[PDB]
C-alpha cells in the first residue's frame, strides 16, 4: 500500500517486529562478539551475513517503508507521498536511524555500536503492542525480564573481557577457561548484579575494582528491575487491589457495628456481582475522567434509544434528552429485592439496562402482573408531579441481579431550568394527565 497507518494494518506491526528483532540482534550480539572469541574466522561469513541482513532491514525501513507512514498535522491525516517523506525527514527518529546506519569498513564488531541507536523503533513497537493486544501487562513483564537479561548479558560480556584482559585461568576470580565460556560469565553476572555472592574473591587491584564497580552498579540495577516488576504487577492488579481494599473496608465496617450476617452477605454479593459484571466499582468515577463529548457519545449509544421511545420524554429538545442521559446513575438490585414498594411515594425513573423485574399485583401481591425485561422503562410518571402527590400503584421486585439506570426528581428539575421550552412542555404534559 502507498499509505500505511500505525493504528491498524498489522503488517506494519509485523515489519516493525522484524526491525525490533534486527535491533535486538545488534544490541545482544555486538558485546558477545567484541568480548568473546566466538567470532572465529571459520564462521566469520555467518556473522557478516547476519550483520548485512540486519543492515538491509535497517536500510529498507529508513528508505522505502517509513516514508509511507501517514501523519496527522493539525488534526488532519496527510496521505500525499511527498508530504509523508518530508515530515519523516523533519522527524527526529529518521535522524536517529540515519545516525544508526553508518559505513564502518576499516572486521571489529565494536564498530557496529551505531546500529544500537535505533531504539525509538523498539519503543514504538512497545506502544503498538500495548495497543493491539489485551492483557498487555504480560508483555511489560516480558520486557522488564528482557531488560534484566540484557543487563546480565552486558555484565557477562564485561566480565569475560576483564578475564581475557588479565588472562583466562590466571587466578580464581577470572574465568578459568573450560565450559561453554558464556554461561559461566552469565553465572558471574547473575551472581554479581543481583548480589548473591559465592563468587571467588578478587585478588589483584583491577579485579577488586571491577568487582566493586560491578556490585555497586548491580545494586541500583537490581533495584531498578525489582521496582519495574513491582510497578508492573501493581498496575496489572491496581483495579483488583482497589476493589478488594474497598470490599474489606466495608466488611470491617459492618463487623465493627455487629451487623447481622444477612446484610453482610447481601453487601458481599452485591460487591462480587458488580466487580464481576462491570469490572469496576463505580461508573461516574470513570465517566468524569473522560472528555465531555466522549461521555455524551457514550450516553447516546447505551440508552438514548431507550429514553427516546417513552411517550412522556417525547417532544423534548434534543439537548434536553442528551443532558438527562449524563445524569442517569447505574444501580444494581439483588434478586428478590423490591425496586418499588406500594404505599411509598415515587420520584425515581427506572430504566432496566440489564435483567428483568416483576410487577406484583392481586390480593396481597404474590402474583406477576408483568415481567419487564431489559430496555423497559417504568416509573416515568413519578418524575412529573408536584412532589409527594404520587404513589407506586404496584410493587416492583427485582427477579434477578438487575442493573437499572435511574433518573430522579430534583436532578431532572435542575435540568428543566436550563431549557424553559422543555420546562413548559413537561409542565403541560404533567397537567394534561392529571
Amino acid at each position: 500500500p502507498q499509505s500505511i497507518d500505525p493504528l491498524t494494518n498489522l503488517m506494519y506491526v509485523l515489519w516493525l517486529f522484524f526491525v525490533v528483532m534486527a535491533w535486538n540482534w545488534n544490541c545482544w550480539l555486538i558485546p558477545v562478539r567484541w568480548a568473546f572469541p566466538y567470532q572465529t574466522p571459520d564462521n566469520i561469513h555467518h556473522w557478516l551475513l547476519m550483520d548485512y541482513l540486519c543492515d538491509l532491514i535497517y536500510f529498507l525501513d529508513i528508505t522505502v517503508f517509513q516514508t509511507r507512514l501517514q501523519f496527522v498535522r493539525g488534526g488532519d491525516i496527510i496521505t500525499d507521498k511527498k508530504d509523508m517523506r518530508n515530515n519523516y525527514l523533519k522527524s527526529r527518529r529518521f535522524k536517529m536511524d540515519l545516525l544508526s546506519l553508518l559505513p564502518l569498513d576499516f572486521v571489529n564488531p565494536l564498530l557496529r555500536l551505531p546500529r544500537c541507536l535505533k531504539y525509538m523503533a523498539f519503543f514504538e513497537f512497545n506502544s503498538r503492542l500495548e495497543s493491539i493486544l489485551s492483557k498487555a501487562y504480560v508483555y511489560r513483564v516480558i520486557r522488564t525480564t528482557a531488560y534484566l537479561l540484557y543487563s546480565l548479558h552486558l555484565n557477562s560480556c564485561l566480565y569475560y573481557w576483564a578475564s581475557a584482559y588479565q588472562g583466562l585461568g590466571s587466578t580464581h576470580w577470572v574465568y578459568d577457561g573450560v565450559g561453554n565460556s558464556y554461561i559461566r560469565c552469565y553465572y558471574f553476572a547473575v551472581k554479581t548484579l543481583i548480589t548473591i555472592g559465592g563468587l571467588p574473591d578478587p585478588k589483584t587491584l583491577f579485579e577488586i575494582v571491577f568487582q566493586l564497580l560491578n556490585y555497586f552498579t548491580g545494586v541500583f540495577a537490581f533495584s531498578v528491575m525489582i521496582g519495574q516488576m513491582r510497578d508492573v504487577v501493581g498496575a496489572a492488579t491496581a483495579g483488583q487491589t482497589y476493589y478488594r481494599s474497598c470490599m474489606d473496608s466495608t466488611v470491617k465496617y459492618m463487623n465493627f457495628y455487629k451487623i447481622p450476617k444477612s446484610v453482610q452477605n447481601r453487601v458481599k454479593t452485591w460487591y462480587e456481582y458488580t466487580w464481576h459484571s462491570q469490572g469496576m466499582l463505580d461508573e461516574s468515577e470513570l465517566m468524569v475522567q473522560l472528555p465531555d463529548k466522549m461521555r455524551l457519545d457514550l450516553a447516546i449509544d447505551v440508552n438514548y434509544n431507550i429514553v427516546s421511545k417513552v411517550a412522556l420524554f417525547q417532544g423534548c429538545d434534543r439537548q434536553m434528552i442528551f443532558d438527562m442521559l449524563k445524569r442517569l446513575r447505574s444501580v444494581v438490585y439483588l434478586p428478590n429485592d423490591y425496586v418499588c414498594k406500594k404505599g411509598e411515594i415515587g420520584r425515581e425513573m427506572y430504566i432496566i439496562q440489564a435483567g428483568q423485574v416483576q410487577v406484583l399485583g392481586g390480593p396481597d401481591g404474590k402474583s406477576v402482573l408483568v415481567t419487564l425485561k431489559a430496555g423497559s422503562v417504568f416509573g416515568e410518571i413519578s418524575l412529573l408531579a408536584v412532589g409527594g402527590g404520587n404513589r407506586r400503584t404496584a410493587n416492583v421486585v427485582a427477579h434477578g441481579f438487575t442493573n437499572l439506570f435511574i433518573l430522579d426528581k430534583k436532578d431532572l428539575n435542575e435540568i428543566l431550568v436550563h431549557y424553559p421550552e422543555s420546562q413548559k412542555l413537561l409542565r403541560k404534559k404533567a397537567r394534561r394527565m392529571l
Binding site: 543481583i194 548473591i196 559465592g198 525489582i226 504487577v233 481494599s245 446484610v263 444501580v331 438490585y333 429485592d337
Partner: protein, 450 residues
C-alpha cells in the same frame, strides 16, 4: 436440583475439591522426582490417588449441575447447564485432567508416577476456592498473606523436586553441586533427600547462594535460570506479601500521614502549646475510641437501598429513640439515614451559637449536650440521646421571631458523637413527605414564643 455458586454448599465443595488439587500439586511431583517416596508408600499413594480421581469425577459432575448467571438470573434447567459446561474450556481442562494415564503404570512400571501431571489442569478450582475464601472470611488480608506463603512453599517444593531430579539425571555423588551418593547412609534417607533438596531450593530461590557452585554447563544453566526465577517470580510474591501487609495498615498509614501533616503545619506556624496539646488530645481520642473510620468514604460505592439497610442497623437505637422519626415518618427515615453525616464535638465547645447562620440540623447519637445562656456557668436542661435541635435555623415558621438565624446555643460537655442534617438535604428529604412535618412546626411554634 441445581447448585448455586453463591451458596455455602458450593464453597464447601470448592474446599472439598481443592484438597485433591493441592495434593496433586504437592505430592505428584515429589513422588516423580523422589522415587523412594513413590516406592515406600505405594499402597498409600495409590489409595490417595484413587480418592483424588473419585473427587475429580464428582467435581466434573458438579460442574454439569451448577448454575451460571445470565442476565442476572440463575439457570435451572439441566440441559442448558450441560451445554454451557461442555462448550467451555473448563470441560476440556477437566477431561484432560481425568484422562486415564494411570494405565501407563503397566507399561512404565511403578517407578514413573509423573503420568499424573495432567491432573494439575484443575488449578482453576483451587484458584476459584482461594478467590471465594477471600470474600467469605473475616480476615481476608491474613488469608491472602497465607495463600501467598503457600504459593512460595509450592514453588520452593517444586524447585527442590527439580533439583533432585536434575541431580539424579546427572548422577548422585558425581560432582560437588549435585546431591551426594544415595549409598551414603547419611544422605540415603528419603527425609534427608527431600530436606536437603528443600534447603538447596530455599537458598537458591531466595538468592542466598551458600551452595556448592555448579561444575557443568547444564548445572550452570539450571542455576542461572533458578536465580532468574527467584528474582522474577519469588521476589514478586514477596513484594506482594509486603503490599498486602501495607494494605492491612493503609488506614493507619493514611490517618498517621494526616496527623503528621497537621503537626508539621502547626510546627512551622508556632502554634501555642495549649492548642497543640488540644489537637493531640483530639487525635488520641479519635484513635482510642476507634472513630478514625468514616462511613462516607467506606460506604461510597453502594446502592442507596443497601446503604440504608447498613445504616439502619448501625443507628437502630438512635432513630428509634427520637420521637418524630421512625414513628410518624413511615419511610422518610430511610431517606434521612443516608443524608445524615456523623460528627464529633470536643468537651466544652459550642456546637451552635446565637446569632450565627445555621446550615444543618443536629441529631444526637451518643452525646450529652446542655443548653446555656451566655457563658455556660448554668445549664437549663441537658439533652440526652435521640433529642433533636437546630431545626429552627433550617426552616422557619410563619410569623417567625427570627429568620435564618439560631435562637439558642448548645454547649457540648464530654466528647459527643452526633448526626448532622444539612439544610438542603433536609429540604430534599422533607419535600417528599410534608405530612409528618406538622409536629416540627408545632415544636417551633411552642419554642419561639418563649
Amino acid at each position: 436440583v441445581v447448585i448455586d455458586p453463591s451458596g455455602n454448599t458450593y464453597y464447601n465443595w470448592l474446599f472439598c475439591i481443592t484438597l485433591p488439587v493441592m495434593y496433586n500439586w504437592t505430592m505428584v511431583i515429589a513422588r516423580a522426582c523422589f522415587d523412594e517416596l513413590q516406592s515406600d508408600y505405594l499402597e498409600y499413594w495409590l489409595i490417595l490417588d484413587y480418592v483424588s480421581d473419585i473427587v475429580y469425577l464428582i467435581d466434573m459432575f458438579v460442574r454439569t449441575r451448577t448454575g451460571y448467571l445470565e442476565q442476572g438470573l440463575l439457570v435451572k434447567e439441566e440441559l442448558k447447564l450441560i451445554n454451557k459446561y461442555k462448550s467451555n474450556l473448563q470441560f476440556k481442562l477437566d477431561v484432560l485432567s481425568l484422562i486415564p494415564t494411570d494405565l501407563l503404570y503397566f507399561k512404565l512400571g511403578w517407578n514413573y508416577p509423573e503420568i499424573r501431571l495432567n491432573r494439575l489442569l484443575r488449578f482453576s478450582r483451587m484458584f476459584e476456592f482461594f478467590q471465594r475464601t477471600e470474600t467469605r472470611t473475616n480476615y481476608p488480608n491474613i488469608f491472602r498473606i497465607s495463600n501467598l506463603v503457600m504459593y512460595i512453599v509450592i514453588i520452593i517444593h517444586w524447585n527442590a523436586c527439580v533439583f533432585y531430579s536434575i541431580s539424579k539425571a546427572i548422577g548422585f555423588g558425581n560432582d560437588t553441586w549435585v546431591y551426594p551418593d544415595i549409598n551414603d547412609p547419611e544422605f540415603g534417607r528419603l527425609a534427608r533427600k527431600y530436606v536437603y533438596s528443600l534447603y538447596w531450593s530455599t537458598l537458591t530461590l531466595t538468592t542466598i547462594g551458600e551452595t556448592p557452585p555448579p561444575v557443568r554447563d547444564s548445572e550452570y544453566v539450571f542455576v542461572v535460570v533458578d536465580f532468574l526465577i527467584g528474582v522474577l517470580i519469588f521476589a514478586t510474591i514477596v513484594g506482594n506479601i509486603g503490599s498486602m501487609i501495607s494494605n492491612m495498615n493503609a488506614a493507619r498509614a493514611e490517618f498517621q500521614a494526616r496527623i503528621d501533616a497537621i503537626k508539621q503545619y502547626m510546627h512551622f506556624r508556632n502554634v501555642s502549646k495549649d492548642m497543640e496539646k488540644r489537637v493531640i488530645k483530639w487525635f488520641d481520642y479519635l484513635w482510642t475510641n476507634k472513630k478514625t473510620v468514616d462511613e462516607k468514604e467506606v460506604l461510597k460505592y453502594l446502592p442507596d437501598k443497601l446503604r440504608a439497610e447498613i445504616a439502619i442497623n448501625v443507628h437502630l437505637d438512635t432513630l428509634k429513640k427520637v420521637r418524630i422519626f421512625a414513628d410518624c415518618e413511615a419511610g422518610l427515615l430511610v431517606e434521612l439515614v443516608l443524608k445524615l453525616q456523623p460528627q464529633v464535638y470536643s468537651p466544652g465547645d459550642y456546637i451552635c451559637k446565637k446569632g450565627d447562620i445555621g446550615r444543618e440540623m443536629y441529631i444526637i447519637k451518643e452525646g450529652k449536650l446542655a443548653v446555656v445562656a451566655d457563658d455556660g456557668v448554668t445549664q437549663f436542661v441537658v439533652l440526652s440521646d435521640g433529642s433533636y435541635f437546630g431545626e429552627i435555623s433550617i426552616l422557619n415558621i410563619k410569623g417567625s421571631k427570627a429568620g435564618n438565624r439560631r435562637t439558642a446555643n448548645i454547649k457540648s460537655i464530654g466528647y459527643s458523637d452526633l448526626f448532622c442534617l444539612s439544610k438542603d438535604d433536609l429540604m430534599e428529604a422533607l419535600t417528599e413527605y410534608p405530612d409528618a412535618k406538622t409536629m416540627l412546626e408545632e415544636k417551633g411554634k411552642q419554642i419561639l414564643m418563649k
